[PDB]
Amino acid sequence: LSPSIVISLSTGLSLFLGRFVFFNFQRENVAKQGLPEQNGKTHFEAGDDRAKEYVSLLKSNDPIGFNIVDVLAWGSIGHIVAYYILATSSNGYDPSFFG
């Protein structure tokens, strides 16, 4: 398997899990935690004028609600698992358990 094939397959199978399988769980956990609450109020509600949850980057169209940040997240996991595969395969290491 060439490394381009490995990277592409693992990334595709990561944001496939993110788009279809592990979407409702991730999003319901997100809604459960919701926001970082500083003394009941959020970080932006209490002030600080910089911790506003960006919506111009999260408004992207999808029937299920996939955004570019989930594309980065599932896909960072993708490239990470791909490079784990690639390095672990390219390293000719013998575990040699019991022998």
Binding site: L13, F22, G92, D94
Partner: protein, 196 residues
């Protein structure tokens, strides 16, 4: 129905649930939501272990393995599974892990999204072919049978794991063969009481 006659039953263990023999010494199922989670996880552990017991004994009787020999091939780089002698062409370590993850994650995460606590354990329908659910007077008997055989299989899996721990390089049918050859002098006693 009591795991130990004479011990008082917990008030939350009435006997109505399948396999409710009142066994809660440590007091884990005192709150009901944890008890429903525990029932679901008990049935999941049970079903996996009792599917596993054939997958441990059968390939050791005829499949020419001993249920850990079926794993050593992945511990050595270069070499794939001998599914009944013939090698499998689906790769050896990484791609089987990919298929396992991508399949059982989907299955178990479509299992996770169930909200009805009875379908969380006893879904039925597509998982109930042959119509062995249309008569609760026997479905309760069958649920008790599932729980009982599953707890038996869980204890048998402890037997597998610990007979593997005591004797590192054997299998359970070899243990039973040793116990059928010389039953007295080749039992657990040489390990609970190590001579040195």
């Amino acid at each position: 129905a009591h795991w130990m006659p004479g011990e008082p039953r917990p008030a939350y263990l009435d006997g109505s649930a399948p396999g409710d023999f009142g066994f809660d010494p440590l007091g884990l199922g005192e709150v009901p939501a944890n008890l429903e989670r525990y029932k679901e996880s008990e049935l999941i552990h049970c079903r996996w272990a009792m599917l596993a017991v054939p997958g441990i004994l059968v390939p050791e009787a005829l499949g020419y393995g001993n249920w850990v020999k079926a794993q050593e091939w992945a511990a050595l780089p270069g070499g794939q599974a001998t599914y009944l002698g013939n090698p499998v062409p689906w790769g050896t370590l990484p791609t089987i892990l990919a298929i396992e993850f991508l399949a059982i994650a989907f299955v178990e995460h479509q299992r996770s999204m169930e909200k009805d606590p009875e379908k969380k354990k006893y879904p039925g329908g597509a998982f109930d072919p042959l119509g062995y659910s249309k008569d609760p007077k026997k479905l309760e008997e069958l649920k008790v049978k599932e729980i009982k055989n599953g707890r038996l299989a869980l204890l048998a899996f402890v037997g597998f794991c610990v007979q593997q721990s005591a004797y590192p390089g054997t299998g359970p049918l070899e243990n039973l063969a040793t116990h059928l050859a010389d039953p007295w002098h080749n039992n657990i006693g040489d390990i609970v009481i190590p001579f040195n």
